[PDB]
Structure 1
Amino acid sequence: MLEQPYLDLAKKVLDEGHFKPDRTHTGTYSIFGHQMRFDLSKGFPLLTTKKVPFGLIKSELLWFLHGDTNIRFLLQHRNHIWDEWAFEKWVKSDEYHGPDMTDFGHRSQKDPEFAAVYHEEMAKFDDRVLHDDAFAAKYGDLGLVYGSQWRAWHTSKGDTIDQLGDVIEQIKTHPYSRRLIVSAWNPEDVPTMALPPCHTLYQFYVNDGKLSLQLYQRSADIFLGVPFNIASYALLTHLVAHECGLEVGEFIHTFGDAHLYVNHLDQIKEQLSRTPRPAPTLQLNPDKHDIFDFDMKDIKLLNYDPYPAIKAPVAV
């Protein structure tokens, strides 16, 4: 079935992973070097062996596509995936004077009542970014994140490069380019960044009127992250083919370090005893073709019938 490359990836890390230490006190089993291929004409690769919230993928990807780096857009769509990087900065300012909250995730996981302390400070930071304009400008903007490295890469001469907008032009004029590459890795920035881009680089390829994309992901959390990763880039591939008037081909997912955190072994073993359903179907608005102006409403998933969600500990 279409998601089978993901269950073979998870099964291979179980059989052959190296127990490896990492940043987090949670350990991992990992491999280095892996590739998976999904043929997007056979169906959209959103996992049916576990319920994955597509609306978070769909809103986070439009945020990227709009060139946006401000949390407010996401919080407006009720997407909280990036709230911690921005909350983190609220907490070091000489403006924040509440409970101490240091390396918040760690203490909020082995949580005292500190979890709802963390969760009320966060509820407060989130509301302030929604309604307070100058607060949103100051603390809601992450600055260096995929919206801006895709669409507004900074030059040494001080202007900006819309790499995604120019590669879409090169695909419409020069489909056979072996140079349709978008990079999110910038050597200058990467020492001071907190999370240097996990989705380091991607490449488009056109052949026989079909568009494929290859992603190079330098680090991947197999249970929690990769099911989102898959669907975000299979949806980028669909969107750029819409705009360019091409059929969709394959999404090829290449990995550097792919890892399973040790406290996700039971959950992934259980997911592995489930049997793939028939894959969902993406529907993109046939009358809008400028994907940078797309809206939530413009992408539909039809027939997604998944198994239950599987609750797992986030690694810290």
Structure 2
Amino acid sequence: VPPHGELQYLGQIQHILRCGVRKDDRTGTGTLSVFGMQARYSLRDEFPLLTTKRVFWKGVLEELLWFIKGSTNAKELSSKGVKDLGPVYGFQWRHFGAEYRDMESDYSGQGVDQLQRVIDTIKTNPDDRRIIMCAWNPRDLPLMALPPCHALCQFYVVNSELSCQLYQRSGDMGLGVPFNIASYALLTYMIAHITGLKPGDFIHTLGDAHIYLNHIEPLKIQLQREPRPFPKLRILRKVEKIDDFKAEDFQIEGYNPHPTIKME
């Protein structure tokens, strides 16, 4: 280019199963879909890493750190242990609107650094209503002129607390949502850390909220599992720049999830 927060996710799954309508996706299989959903996860002295199934936290932290450095090299992520990709979210977050060339091209000072702009705006005017960052699906870029974004994050500050609202055009409830809740909650913790603010709430809003048919049986089982109190996220070191964050700087404490659930 207070009830356990997890209950909302479980309620949404249950709602899609009973009320969702069959709808085909771009490619793959059919889904059960509902349009328009929203859930709020408190980030106050607790982290929304879902417990009704073991979430791949290692992949969340590692993928996010990869996006922050604006690296578009998959080999730089696959090595970290999580398994030229083009203008991925990383390139978009730090070099928005530039012009992608290669994974080795230096885009220093090229394009708008949406991420730094968010941090800068939080510092220059916490009341600002335009603290927004957007991401596109790489495959849409060459498809048309001025294509719509895939997701957007809006930040909000009040009473020394930072909140974030993620709006996603579509959400794969079985495989994608649990992971993304952790990803953006984490991003919020990071930004809050460097702007001297305390994490507030993470609001997850979806357009086409859907469950792939091959995930129905596994989710029905996940629904029988009672949530365990959410863990906590600790930032061991004091960081001043969003680029100075390292995986070793974060530590999940008290995470007691139910067994892993494989979603095809």
Q: How many residues align?
A: 250
Selected match of 1:308 from 241, 259, 262: 259
The answer to whether the 8 Å contact 2:5/2:41 transfers is yes
Structure 2, gaps ≥5 residues long: 100-106
Partner residue in 1 for 2:102:
none
- What is the CA–CA distance in structure 2 between the aligned matches of 1:189 and 1:274, rounded to whole Å? 38
Partner residue in 2 for 1:35:
38
RMSD: 2.1
The answer to whether the 8 Å contact 1:184/1:197 transfers is no
Selected match of 1:77 from 80, 90, 104: 80
- For the pair 1:23 / 2:7, whether they are aligned, the reply is no
Q: Going by fraction, where is helix more abundant, 1 or 2?
A: 1
- For the pair 1:212 / 2:215, whether they are aligned, the reply is no
- What is the CA–CA distance in structure 1 between the aligned matches of 2:189 and 2:122, rounded to whole Å? 14
The answer to whether the 8 Å contact 1:21/1:28 transfers is yes
TM-score by length of 2: 0.89
Equivalence map 1:143-154=2 (5 Å) = 143-154=86-97
The answer to whether the 8 Å contact 2:239/2:245 transfers is yes
Moved more, 279-288 or 204-213: 279-288
- What is the CA–CA distance in structure 2 between the aligned matches of 1:36 and 1:214, rounded to whole Å? 10
Displacement, 1:52?
A: 0.8
**Which secondary structure does the structure 1 equivalent of 2:91 belong to?**
helix
Q: Deviations over 1:39-61 (max 9, x none)?
A: 11151111111011101000000
One-letter amino acid matched to 2:10: L
Partner residue in 1 for 2:85:
142
- What is the CA–CA distance in structure 2 between the aligned matches of 1:155 and 1:46, rounded to whole Å? 34
1:274–1:198 CA distance, 2 compared to 1 (3 A): farther
TM-score by length of 1: 0.75
**Which secondary structure does the structure 2 equivalent of 1:211 belong to?**
strand
Partner residue in 1 for 2:103:
none
One-letter amino acid matched to 2:97: H
- What is the CA–CA distance in structure 1 between the aligned matches of 2:218 and 2:128, rounded to whole Å? 42
Selected match of 2:232 from 281, 285, 305: 281
Partner residue in 2 for 1:134:
none
- For the pair 1:252 / 2:203, whether they are aligned, the reply is yes
The answer to whether the 8 Å contact 1:285/1:298 transfers is yes
Partner residue in 1 for 2:66:
63
One-letter amino acid matched to 1:41: R
1:312–1:34 CA distance, 2 compared to 1 (3 A): same
One-letter amino acid matched to 2:236: N
Partner residue in 1 for 2:131:
180
**Which secondary structure does the structure 1 equivalent of 2:71 belong to?**
coil
The answer to whether the 8 Å contact 1:66/1:293 transfers is no
Selected match of 1:7 from 10, 15, 20: 10
- What is the CA–CA distance in structure 1 between the aligned matches of 2:219 and 2:258, rounded to whole Å? 13
The answer to whether the 8 Å contact 2:233/2:252 transfers is yes
Partner residue in 1 for 2:154:
203
- What is the CA–CA distance in structure 2 between the aligned matches of 1:187 and 1:287, rounded to whole Å? 34
Selected match of 1:293 from 220, 244, 251: 244
Displacement, 1:286?
A: 3.5
Displacement, 1:11?
A: 0.7
